[PDB]
Structure 1
Amino acid sequence: ADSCIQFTRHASDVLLNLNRLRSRDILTDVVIVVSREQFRAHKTVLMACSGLFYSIFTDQLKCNLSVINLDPEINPEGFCILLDFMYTSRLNLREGNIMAVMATAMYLQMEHVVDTCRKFIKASE
């Protein structure tokens, strides 16, 4: 209806609780493997944040897998930084990790993150 009222902080309050569930390992349903480093997560949050995970978990066979192995060229620290961003809206971008974060975001299909990385690199040139 056009007569709805809206609670400004609701989406942020939901995301905070999804990160608390991840930290306590509550109802996590997939393990993402990056060069033998393992990360537990919720398939719905991964799909909501990435073009790659949206394609994987809408596939009739891959939707039922409990383990997903990423390309061996993907950096575990870069993946960890992006997983934290998915669950908090905060991106830990530093001189020492920006190249790995950008390459991981290109693979995961997160367009706005790729664009921000490109702008930060161009400013230091």
Structure 2
Amino acid sequence: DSCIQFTRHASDVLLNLNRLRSRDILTDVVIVVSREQFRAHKTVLMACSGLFYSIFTDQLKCNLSVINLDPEINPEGFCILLDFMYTSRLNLREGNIMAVMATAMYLQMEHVVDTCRKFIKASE
């Protein structure tokens, strides 16, 4: 087509979605991790994660207001990944990299799994 494009539009949209999350506006699901609860927007979770995409496209699960993750999932790893979904920023540290990579593999967040693998390989 002959469209023009606003470079900062996608980043501005994500920033606003994160502001709605902060203020708990229109959040429609609670993700339960080892008795730690995280409120979010189903659409943002689906847009970021192959696991949430599969969950919320399921005819029965699409209607659930609570999703319980596997007990092996670490709440801090989940929290770091949820922050990444809403900001593009990943708080990757020596002390959390193993939990973050394991959580990203479970959530099916391929780009995060890729940078964790590379950061681990550099330290060996």
TM-score, normalization: structure 2? 0.99
Gaps of 5+ in 1: none
Instruction: Return the offset for 1:112.
Output: 1.1
Structure 2 CA distance for aligned equivalents of residues 45 and 115 of structure 1: 21
Q: Secondary structure of 1:39's match?
A: strand
Structure 2 CA distance for aligned equivalents of residues 65 and 75 of structure 1: 22
Aligned to 2:118: 119
Aligned to 2:53: 54
What is the alpha-carbon root mean square deviation over aligned residues? 0.3
Name the % identity.
Answer: 100
TM-score, normalization: structure 1? 0.99
Structure 2 CA distance for aligned equivalents of residues 89 and 112 of structure 1: 11
Q: Secondary structure of 2:26's match?
A: coil
- How many residue pairs get aligned? The number is 124
Deviations 1:33-53 (A, max 9, x none): 000000000000000000000
Q: Secondary structure of 1:72's match?
A: coil
Structure 2 CA distance for aligned equivalents of residues 10 and 40 of structure 1: 25
Structure 2 CA distance for aligned equivalents of residues 121 and 94 of structure 1: 11
Structure 2 CA distance for aligned equivalents of residues 27 and 35 of structure 1: 24
Structure 1 CA distance for aligned equivalents of residues 83 and 5 of structure 2: 27
Deviations 1:89-115 (A, max 9, x none): 000000000000000000000111101
Instruction: Return the offset for 1:20.
Output: 0.2
Q: Secondary structure of 1:101's match?
A: helix
Q: Secondary structure of 2:31's match?
A: strand
Gaps of 5+ in 2: none
Structure 2 CA distance for aligned equivalents of residues 112 and 85 of structure 1: 11
**1:1-125 residue pairs with structure 2 within 5 A?**
2-125=1-124
Structure 2 CA distance for aligned equivalents of residues 84 and 113 of structure 1: 12
Deviations 1:14-47 (A, max 9, x none): 0000000000000000000000000000000000
Structure 2 CA distance for aligned equivalents of residues 13 and 111 of structure 1: 23
